[model samples]
Target chain A: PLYFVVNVIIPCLLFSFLTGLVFYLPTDSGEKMTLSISVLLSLTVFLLVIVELIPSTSSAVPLIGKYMLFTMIFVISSIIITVVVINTHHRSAMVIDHILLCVFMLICIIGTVSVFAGRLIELSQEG
Target chain B: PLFYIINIIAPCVLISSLVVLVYFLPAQAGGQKCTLSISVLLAQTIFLFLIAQKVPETSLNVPLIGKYLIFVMFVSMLIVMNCVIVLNVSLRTGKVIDKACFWIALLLFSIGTLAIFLTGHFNQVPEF
Candidate 1:
């Protein structure tokens, strides 16, 4: 049960949490808006692709593979939102755009690292 | 083959072309469009990898999904370029619509180009 919870439960919860977080993250229209939308889009893709690449499996589709594919649908939806948002002609932005992208990138790297960190927690618990 | 083309192929392909027009919306991006394009292209690559796994002798490296990926990639670049183009403009009243229309057409045009490359197989070998 604990292994199931840690391996199965935590990532699924966090994946949805991240997807919802992307949905809720605010932006006005013009400036920060485009920036926010792009950063959010890229972060989701980066995370999803990373997960897609990392799932180790044999035959029956491990717990991680199912979780990754399940979460990928959210990534695809995020891309759809991004394509719509950017094309829609909102306010406008200047230099601050890249700032959001960078910050979002950092956030993703941190989250990915934490998953590996969780791997460590599992390893340590066993010993 | 025509039925396959008519039924399966043209349907997604046409919709994909139409999807290009959606680029006219806010059409924002910096390197942002470039980044988005590449990410999309990456996703398409995975889909290609998935298709290529067991599906083909000729189709694997030849037709179908590889061609589709290239098509998707070109359209993505068109979006990125549109992003750059729209950004550089004044965004005044009249010209904004003009640019949007122009870019959307440009995007749709690329999707059309995909058909030209269909089952686009070469007879030579890449020894490099």
Candidate 2:
């Protein structure tokens, strides 16, 4: 479990999160690098299957696996936008300048807080 | 079933957009993909119509996918402006700036879509 958490899981997450980072600030001459970086990050979805080394099937995975599956889907879904944006070369304002940018941020934040709160309550009751 | 519509099915349909971008290369500028974008959006609007009729009216707690469909609807507006992107791509003009705009817009829509699903699952009351 610790092995999964430390090595496989965290690395998988970092791949997704790091793609977000490379996105916000690309280089001064952003074109070539953005494409290259996106390709790398996009493929990391498969890099996740480095789990194939151990080769365990969906037995335990499906239990907590739904969240992990969601994680990967979230990564691929995010990549959809990255692919389009990187491919696009039309004029537009920065994304953050837009109002809708923060809507999801707010929704995600509030939802996460409530989820953690719910989990804490459950854990306390269990204890 | 209402939960399933936006949450489960919509993403699959949304995944179809992935195929549309293959036409977005800096090469094919005559706005060739405009028809595809329009067709998809037209299809989506009809989809919205059908789902709206089927789902029970519930303003109280609309599913997270409901919120995102609206958001994606907004982004689809960009795809609606087929000429602009195809125009940029055709001339190979502003080669760098166009890519930035593209990336920013893509990040906003896709990340926003993911956010929709993530929050819904997280905030959900656990069955256990």
Candidate 3:
């Protein structure tokens, strides 16, 4: 557990911090680097959720059952947003697209928080 | 648990729904709509926090504290996003600034979530 915490959690925290640091970098040239870092962090998080978190569940069926619903919704939402962003034609349209993206991100964050909280509560009850 | 879930989750769901509605609305009107929605959501979050505090046994406290912190961060992001939209519209140019603001907001939320997760771990440790 100590090794997992050191190797996995610590790196995840650092990658997230580095992602934030890249966001504040002050130049157009730096933005490409920022975007790259964001992409890397996203991939890291995705893998962490899938591999480390998901497999650790004791009840595999119910665990997969619940997450599959979330996965489907997230996939559908992503497809819709991608289509909308791609189809946008004007400069004003882009602002609306950004707003939609912001809203989507907000929902995703809320969902993530709720899942973690629910799991924590469940674990506490089990003990 | 049911009461806690209903009372807290209802308001959050409502606020997010309103955000979705606002996002879908036509943007020709101006900053007023964004300002209104953000203010309403902000108030709703505060109200939810108050409700969460009233629950017995203090289990709700953990999630409440976590979400309250995130709520502040979310409100800040919304403010920055609103400002970017207004500036982008009023100035009639500079899309890059808007994009930059979006990324900054994302960064803020990422940090906020990390903080919330860490807090949860700390809260689980025995206090005596």
**What lDDT does each candidate get?**
0.42, 0.42, 0.39
State in Å the error of residue B63, model 1: 12
A7-100: candidate 2 lDDT, tens digit per residue: 7546645654444444433322334342433444344334424433323443335344334344344444444444443343211145522312
State TM-scores per candidate: 0.40, 0.38, 0.26
* Ranking 2 against 3 by TM-score, winner: 2
B9-76 per-residue lDDT for model 1 (tens digits): 42234223223422333243343443443333344334334433423553554566465556545554
Tens digits of lDDT, candidate 3, B1-128:
23333323433333333233233322421344344434434443444344434433354544444454465445545533543453443334334444434443454346446545655565566342
- Candidates 1 and 3 compared: the better one by DockQ is 1
Q: Which sections of candidate 1 miss by over 4 Å? A: A1-12, A27-35, A54-74, A81-127, B1-93, B96-98, B109-113, B116-128
* Highest-scoring model, TM-score: 1
What does the TM-score come to for chain B in model 2?
0.40
Query: Rank by DockQ, descending?
Result: 1, 2, 3
Predicted candidate 2 versus true structure: per-residue lDDT over B63-108, tens digit per residue: 5446545644444445434334443443344455355347534654
Worst 10 residues of 1 chain A by lDDT: A88-97
Ranked candidates (TM-score, high to low):
1, 2, 3
Worst 10 residues of 3 chain B by lDDT: B20-29
